[PDB]
Amino acid sequence: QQFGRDVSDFTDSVRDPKTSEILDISPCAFGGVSVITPGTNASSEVAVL
Amino acid sequence: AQALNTLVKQLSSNFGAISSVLNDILSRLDPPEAEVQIDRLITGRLQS
Numbered sequence: 564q565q566f567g568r569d570v571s572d573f574t575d576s577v578r579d580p581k582t583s584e585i586l587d588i589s590p591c592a593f594g595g596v597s598v599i600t601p602g603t604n605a606s607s608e609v610a611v612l
Numbered sequence: 613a614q615a616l617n618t619l620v621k622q623l624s625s626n627f628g629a630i631s632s633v634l635n636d637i638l639s640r641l642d643p644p645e646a647e648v649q650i651d652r653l654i655t656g657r658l659q660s
């Protein structure tokens with residue numbers, strides 16, 4: 564073997580062709596951004612999520 | 613669970629276009645015609 568797959572056909576793991584080390588591949592990162600606010604009249608500052 | 617499967621099965625469908633992998637139409641054809649076949653994958657995946 565040389566490489567592996569997830570529950571899809573996407574490649575998740577690889578044998579390193581230079582040293583035979585078994586590697587795993589994460590997603591890099593992503594996600595949603597949510598902004599929390601007390602409202603514009605009372606303040607003008609936010610926290611993020 | 614079957615909805616999340618059915619969404620994720622059709623990543624592998626070509627929708628009649630060249631290949632379900634973008635890089636294989638990127639690296640292998642002309643960037644004009646690469647724009648053609650990825651735009652068929654983009655709309656086809658966007659309908660799912």
Ligand SMILES: *[C@@H]1O[C@H](CO)[C@@H](O[C@@H]2O[C@H](CO)[C@@H](O)[C@H](O)[C@H]2NC(C)=O)[C@H](O)[C@H]1NC(C)=O
Nearest residue numbers: 564565577578579580581582583584585586587
């Ligand atoms: C690439 O191959 C060389 C040899 O073909 C590897 O060097 C060996 O590494 C192991 C592990 O440290 C040692 O037991 C051997 O004595 C080394 N041999 C020689 C001739 O140096 C090298 O490790 C390989 N590359 C990688 C990234 O592992």
